[PDB]
């Protein structure tokens, strides 16, 4: 599993304001990391918006998944245990914008 | 809720190899972010620094073990009933950010 892939996966159960539901998530970590840990770091996709703050729009880039990437909510998940399913990849431009947002808070 | 604080909190329920239990976690995101979102990003503490694991030892921290810088998670600290324990020295926080940052390389 590569950085930049969108996977459909259940994030439940959750507490409080935590992002809920089965939804697309974007893989942040690279293949080697994902292979060794079996615990990729992902950010969730939620619902035609413009990029603003931690929310990066997926509109107009040629992919099937719609909405925005919530770069403020990274989570380490056991994709295999949760039964995630690979959907597609995002263009490197989107991935780099996401990495840029995460860089402001995880470094 | 500041970057560098260790809080004791229930992480459950989680799946598979994800960390579980009620354990110490280290807050990675800054106070303003934590206030606005109510959803700090934390890395868990589990029982020498090696790879993504940063040792808490030798620097006056009461919490023992290693910080798993490879396992960030966004949690609602308040909803889970987290309790603030202590704050790590900046040297430790800088080592943690150093390792954590590499997930973005």
Polypeptide structure, described:
The structure is a homodimer. The longest helix of chain A is centred in the C-terminal third of the chain and has 12 residues, at 92-103. Chain A has helices at residues 31-37, 79-82, 92-103; strands at 5-10, 22-27, 41-46, 55-57, 68-70, 75-76, 85-89. Helix content of chain A is 21%, strand content 29%. In chain A, strands 1, 2, 3, 4, 5, 6 and 7 form a seven-stranded antiparallel β-sheet that branches. By secondary structure, chain A is of the alpha+beta class. Chain A is globular and about 35 Å long. The two termini of chain A are 24 Å apart. The interface between A and B is medium-sized, with 30 and 29 residues. The PDB classes it as toxin. The entry lists the keywords Plasmid Maintenance, toxin.
């Amino acid at each position: 599993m590569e950085r930049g892939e969108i996977w459909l996966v259940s994030l439940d159960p959750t507490a409080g304001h935590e992002q809920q539901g089965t939804r697309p998530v974007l893989i942040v970590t690279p293949a080697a990391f994902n292979r060794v840990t079996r615990l990729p770091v992902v950010v969730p996709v939620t619902s035609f918006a413009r990029t603003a703050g931690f929310a990066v729009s997926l509109d107009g880039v040629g992919i099937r998944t719609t909405g925005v990437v919530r770069c403020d909510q990274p989570r380490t998940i056991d994709m295999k245990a949760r039964g995630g399913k690979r959907l597609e990849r995002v263009p490197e431009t989107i991935m780099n914008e996401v990495l840029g947002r995460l860089s402001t808070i995880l470094t």
